[PDB]
């Protein structure tokens, strides 16, 4: 490195291309054995090597690999540098605008331009990781934040975690300040991009910043968001204010993650480090300014929703954000079940759960994928955690405000979107919820009995309701309560009517719900036998579709044998004849033989119950098999 004037015999604009690559490797290696003890920290002809980049980063005649390696030298050239950052920034600016588009859908992957582009991004993350630097972290985020899920950001996120883990609190203050000041300042840009700044970079870093003095950031900034949240409501007078629902939104989203991580001994104690909501000079004994300022979340819950707005999606997820924050402060500081209840579950008629949810999305299921598909909605994981935690921290009054709200409002007074959202918090939480199932089932099974759930026939939500319902039976055992019967009748008639599926493995599963839905759980049946006849009896020599009524009669048989054809509006002299006659349809095994397999159980029933019909049904069977004996010896 001392021979730096002789070294300047290379790096010329007129150089052999393989040697334009080869020269970089020597300085790229040297700093890895040297660790920047010369030609780096304001020492040697550092200004000359650092200005040589102004000639190189201006060339046009290149692949992305001279440039790709050049950006990989930066981790050393701006380690510890207190100046010349504007010399770097202007060539980074001229590089990024030329080589990379505003959106990645410019390219199908495997076109060479894209493989070179993603390699520049790899080389910049390789550069970021061991720069540990706020200059590069800032400059990277504004290249990422332009659309969602477009460069496989799940690889980029790993670099943020890695620098958040391995570094000092003072460097991490520099990181966190630079990305905060970027988000805080209101120089005009698209609101969607403006969300993604916190949401898809800053927030990812916060979750992984080091355990101690992470409080130093929040204690330095906390006054800003609190002073922001208390105003602007008289200025919703034009559409550009979507840039503002974004700021309040992000400002809820940079503190719930700080109620997360942080110790109980800082957030509720005799000594209030975070006493900065007030001046804190006099309020050093005890922390309660949180429960002074929960009012801010309250406004974000209970705003009487506007009559004619045009930002409703951003309104919705704003209401969600402050609700997450209300979870996060309460589940830390407000330790009573009385204040976990709090306002948090207990509203005046500007009711919470009616506000958080879009009321027009058809929100349909898929029983056949490829939970985090449509459970991917806001709040759901937080609320499973909220109830799960307090189940370890011990009553019907908590769910009374929920189950009987969605239950007694069977009417359109709540939309179906609300009822399914409430029901989802049951389904994923049965093992947390067993004690109350007796009075919860009247609401919860009424949902699956209601004439619409969005399901075209059976769908995964009814499957989850009926599975949870059955799963309660051992401890809860609801039978014979006055509504249970008339709903169970509607369940069985529906579950059986729509049982079929084009895919054999799915059809076999629907059928297996019935087997336990009777034998483990109802006397209260009124078995839908008037259907069952139509599910088999429609003659055609190449029908497979008779077979379902065979299989289904095999379920209503195998459950310790309830009787067949009592008073159901159909005649035994026709009904059983068809059920035998099916075994003429010899084209398919499951059509003909399965009818005989059922009948060999029917005789065992009627003979052992000593009823007269075996005097006739034995003759029906015998008459038909004779037709095979003379004509089809194998069948």
């Amino acid at each position: 490195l001392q021979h730096w004037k002789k070294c300047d015999s290379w790096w010329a604009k007129d150089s052999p291309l393989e040697t334009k690559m080869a020269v970089l490797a020597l300085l790229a290696k040297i700093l890895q054995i040297d660790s920047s003890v010369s030609f780096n920290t304001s020492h040697g002809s550092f200004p000359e090597v650092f200005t040589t980049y102004i000639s190189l980063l201006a060339d046009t005649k290149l692949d992305l690999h001279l440039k790709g390696q050049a950006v990989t030298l930066l981790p050393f050239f701006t380690s510890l540098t207190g100046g010349s950052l504007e010399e770097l920034r202007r060539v980074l600016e001229q590089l990024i605008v030329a080589h990379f588009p505003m959106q990645s859908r410019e390219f199908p992957p495997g076109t060479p331009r894209f493989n070179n582009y993603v390699d520049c991004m790899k080389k910049f993350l390789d550069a970021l990781e061991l720069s540990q630097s706020p200059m590069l972290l800032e400059l990277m985020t504004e290249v990422l934040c332009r659309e969602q899920q477009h460069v496989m950001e799940e690889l980029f996120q790993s670099s943020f975690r890695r620098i958040a883990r391995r570094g000092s609190c003072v460097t991490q203050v520099g990181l966190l300040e630079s990305v905060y000041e970027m988000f805080r300042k209101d120089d005009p840009r698209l609101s969607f991009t403006r969300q993604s700044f916190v949401d898809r970079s800053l927030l990812t870093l916060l979750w992984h910043c080091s355990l101690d003095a992470l409080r130093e950031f929040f204690s330095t900034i906390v006054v800003d968001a609190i002073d922001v949240l208390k105003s602007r409501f008289t200025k919703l007078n034009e559409s550009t204010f979507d840039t503002q629902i974004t700021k309040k939104m992000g400002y809820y989203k940079i503190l719930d993650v700080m109620y997360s991580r942080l110790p109980k001994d800082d957030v509720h104690a005799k000594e209030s480090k975070i006493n900065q909501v007030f001046h804190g000079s006099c309020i050093t004994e005890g922390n309660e300014l949180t429960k002074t300022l929960i009012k801010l979340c309250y406004d974000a819950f209970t705003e009487n929703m506007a009559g004619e707005n045009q930002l409703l999606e951003r309104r919705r997820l704003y209401h969600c954000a402050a609700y997450n924050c209300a979870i996060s402060v309460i589940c830390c500081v407000f330790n009573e079940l009385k204040f976990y209840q709090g306002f948090l579950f207990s509203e005046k008629p500007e009711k919470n759960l009616l506000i958080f949810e879009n009321l027009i999305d058809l929100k349909r299921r898929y029983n056949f994928p490829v939970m985090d598909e449509l459970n991917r909605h806001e709040c759901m994981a937080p609320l499973t955690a909220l109830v799960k935690h307090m189940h370890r921290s011990l009553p019907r009054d908590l769910p009374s405000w929920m189950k009987f709200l969605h239950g007694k409002l069977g009417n359109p007074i709540v939309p179906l979107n609300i009822r399914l959202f409430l029901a989802k918090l049951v389904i994923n939480t049965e093992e947390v919820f067993r004690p109350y199932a007796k009075h919860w089932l009247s609401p919860l099974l009424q949902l699956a009995a209601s004439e619409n759930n969005g399901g075209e026939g059976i769908h995964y939500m009814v499957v989850e309701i009926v599975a949870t319902i059955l799963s309660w039976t051992g401890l809860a055992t609801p039978t014979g309560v006055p509504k249970d019967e008339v709903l169970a009748n509607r369940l069985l008639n529906f579950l059986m009517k729509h049982v079929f599926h084009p895919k054999r493995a799915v059809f076999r599963h629907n059928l297996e719900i019935i087997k336990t839905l009777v034998e483990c759980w109802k006397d209260c049946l009124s078995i839908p036998y008037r259907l069952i006849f139509e599910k088999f009896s429609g003659k055609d020599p190449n029908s497979k579709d008779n077979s379902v009524g065979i299989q289904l009669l095999g379920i209503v048989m195998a459950n310790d044998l309830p009787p067949y054809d009592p008073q159901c509006g159909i005649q035994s002299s026709e009904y059983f004849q068809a059920l035998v006659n099916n075994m003429s349809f010899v084209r398919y095994k499951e059509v003909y033989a399965a009818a005989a397999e059922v009948l060999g159980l029917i005789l065992r029933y009627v003979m052992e119950r000593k009823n007269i019909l075996e005097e006739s049904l034995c003759e029906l069977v015998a008459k038909q098999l004779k037709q095979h004996q003379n004509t089809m010896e194998d069948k």
């Binding site: 429960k291 929960i294 207990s346």
Partner: peptide, 7 residues
């Protein structure tokens, strides 16, 4: 419900 807020 302002007294489920506060204290």
């Amino acid at each position: 419900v302002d007294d489920l807020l506060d204290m």
